[model samples]
Target: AGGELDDGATIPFGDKHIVFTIDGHTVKPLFFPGGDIGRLAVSGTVNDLAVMGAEPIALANSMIIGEGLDMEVLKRVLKSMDETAREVPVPIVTGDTKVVEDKIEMFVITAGIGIAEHPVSDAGAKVGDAVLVSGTIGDHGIALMSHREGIAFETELKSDVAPIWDVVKAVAETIGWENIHAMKDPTRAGLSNALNEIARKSNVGILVREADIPIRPEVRAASEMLGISPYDVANEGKVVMVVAREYAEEALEAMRKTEKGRNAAIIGEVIADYRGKVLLETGIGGKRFMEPPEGDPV
Candidate 1:
């Protein structure tokens, strides 16, 4: 494999296959505007595979139920997962369920496998490549925060947790995998951390134009109110792709053809200097370094 796989067990079994997994303990109020924990479970895995240049094919689900957890809620979550799996044409072939005696939050782990026609590896990123983002950022983070904290915003901001493999496939067909350098789904650590990691791994510097970054007004308001930077929060379905400069416009147009990527934009470019660093050109004509995230992982 050209790219490093984080978890050995998580690697797909078949040739040229990609695997992705996500484990999370979502609290009460099992549903959100755009989706629920079940939908999130599927969407997360789907996005992971898609950004890796893979077309998702199958999934394995595991659920842990606490002693006091409601059976109805568990059923609903599973049913949601089932519906979403069908929508994506990826079946949940097998799963494990465990019942614990202690009182704890419910947890779900969804793992998926997929095939990649043109494998886009992180190692493919090089200086001079153009960086593009799929759509508006912070929708997922803001929506989760609002639902969890019971805060409302002026404009409704819903989670962007939808499958993006179709969009990835579309772009691949247009530009091929060789032209697609690096691809990543911005999840827990959001765009800032994601870009920083890519830059460090590829030994390149990334310069992002802050003014060009898309941010919905509601997301901006919520982030500002909660003292959170929209760029640092998690996004479920967004992708950060580094493609050759020559194919940047075509890639953007390809992504725009899909509903999930309608707002896609060429937000940044890779540079040779400041290797392993990410710099942001502020709207005010100033520059600031985006340090790699430190401390405990989210």
Candidate 2:
């Protein structure tokens, strides 16, 4: 009855189980290649609760605007946030706004709440659990970096910014909550960091296959020129799932059924060998430890 729960914020309310998550974001442009601050606000907040196996519900948002902000920009930001919420089947039902005397353009504070029966935890990964990812990696980070710095790609790189409740829904419904051991969205610190967090939490080891980690070709090129690791970058629309080995195929099948998870793939497996560590088995059979990152390696 006292095992770990993913995202770590499960609260029971009478007959209903509630999960809540909060986030604050401040980006230079406030808008980026795939999404703006508003959309990121909603997506990021809801994602935190989603990995804990929470069903879409409601949100509380707070905005801090600098004095003399552009009216048009504000409208776009707010509108995006609202639309994202509606699509997730979650509503931003309450909020507070404040004006700040600073150089900042805008800031968003979002809190999301949802219902779940049996919540998964980052620490719930088992020794033999297989690792799966929702979709392409590093698209969000690569797009943001290039867009921010005026770097261009042959393809118009767009951040992978979308709410993934439906993708999560499929996993929960198809495999049942009990079958999925742990989950986390590879966000600010990307897949490596997400796996590291799970490894630390579960006190287990994880071995990832370099060939299996999915990354868009454009993202790989951009990351190479930018001198960054794709797996250490940020993402707004992806999740890393650690599931019981026997159910790995089933989980991937369920995830692939949703738009957000159309590219879902089995990436690696939780291991008993390297307790509290993450390692990558290179394509050429070389082995190296994948360091848990501090933040997005710009």
Candidate 3:
């Protein structure tokens, strides 16, 4: 095999798989409704490792700050970062910082290290595995865009940005880690993109019912106004897990027991036909091919 596209890298370490991932955050307005860049940076990295069935061990960071940024703002960000780290109970073992002449306020780069007896893959979706989402989709992306655009909805929208290891761990304990064949955190390109990637990589088919997906009505309205499909937007604190069908209900039960997975739903299942494609069954009398986002539509 030439190479494989995965959420992160995994190396065999004796009887365990050492998992690691790195990510850079340059999200504008650094502070959003439900979370800020600090939380985003840590949560993103942690989720990357968690989705691979790893227990996060430690985190490392490197920050580049602009010359004229306010010290208080920096302190606030750091405080948020630390609080999130404490939530995961993982320490920031090492870090580096630099003051830059560039106009950027701050750029955070985070790396996470974890360990797992059996690491998961996005390409292990079986023909009959059940596709499940940890929670509602499009919240993080819509919340950010609406805030930036000064758009308002009757109900408030906030970024669902938080670490999801609790949900993952619960499922693993309930259904066994090996049953979690495939997992992904739907971030940048959202649910449709993540599902497509899994289908292509696993050489399987996925068919999901729109009725079963958990999308907020406000998110739907906002997405319609913005001409973006909720399925194509991003989610900061959600997971798409393809678990073995035999234990799918149990896995769903375990997920729902966690705070993060209260809205967890079984969307559909892997199929043998339509290999490498995602088919959406719109409850409105028709079915369509849900395409992967070309890129960020914002």
Candidate 4:
């Protein structure tokens, strides 16, 4: 009696094997305040594997180099990727490169492979589980926007593109695998999309309190001035996890102990009846619906 689970039907890909892929296209100022396209490429793929409970071991990178692109810039980006892979302990075992004839934006595709001791799928999120985020949002998006728009704010907002595999491993060690119901990295669509995907996939509702969500002042300012909701921006290295209610506190503490997750917080919880929807309760007590983002460029 097999039917569809939540977020569409899942095809069984053999006995719980781990295989995932991530692709990113970063244009213009390839380098930003916190990181460059190279760093984002590695971090994005690693986080995708990590959130799936995979111990990332290797990566396969492919790059599309534009015609007449600066050789030095390409070298720097490659160097950045190499450094990140080493720092994360995931070697780029194999890859390819293609030079285009016409002017083309640099693009990357990274495929990561790993072993998952306990696999976590978006379908695992359950009612009563606490929703947790590794750190603040809007940093990467704001940084990119500011760089693109030439907006000068009082303070500099750096991109929060840092690997979370170590911190995620620490949290899993402290709370065990089962306690972590769902895990994801908010990237192209940011926190709103990440949570909404989980909610819809698990047939659960998420209740996030606005005040409980952490946002750096500089990021907030840049986002507001640009008419963007911090919740709707992208994060290359941030993580969002759902943990069992009993272990939520322990999980939060474990995450906080890590450098990348020092700002970790249990900002919300899964609800049974509000399945397929996300609600953000504002600081002033106004509740608003958070639908998945549309037409996001990332």
lDDT of each: 0.81, 0.87, 0.90, 0.83
**Clash count, one per candidate:** 0, 4, 0, 0
lDDT, candidate 2, equals 0.87
For each candidate in turn, the TM-score is 0.90, 0.94, 0.96, 0.92
Whichever of 3 and 4 has more TM-score, that candidate is 3
Best lDDT among the predictions, by candidate number? 3
What is the lDDT, from 0 to 100, of the residue 85 in candidate 2?
Answer: 89
- lDDT per residue as tens, model 2, 1-298: 6883234377889987888788888876888888899999898887888888888688999999999799899999999998998888787889999998997889999888888878788989998899999999999888888887788877789998888878888987888888889989888778888998999899999999999988888889889888898998888888888888989999999988888999999999989888988999988999888886653334
**Candidate with better lDDT, 3 vs 4:** 3
Kindly report which residue stretches of model 3 are placed more than 4 angstroms away from their true locations once superposed: 1-6, 295-298
Candidate order by TM-score, decreasing, is 3, 2, 4, 1
Residues forming the 10-long window of minimal summed lDDT in candidate 2: 1-10
Give the TM-score (vs. native) of candidate 4. Answer: 0.92
- In the predicted model 2, the residue pairs found to clash are 5-121, 6-120, 6-121, 6-122
Task: For residues 230-254, write the lDDT of model 1, one tens digit per residue.
Answer: 8888887788899999999999999
In angstroms, give how far residue 56 of model 3 lies from its true place: 0.5
lDDT of each residue in 6-35, candidate 3, tens digit only:
478998888889998999999989899999
The lDDT, on a scale of 0 to 1, for candidate 4 is 0.83
Which 10-residue window in model 1 sums to the lowest lDDT?
A: 4-13
Error of 2 at 76 (Å): 0.9
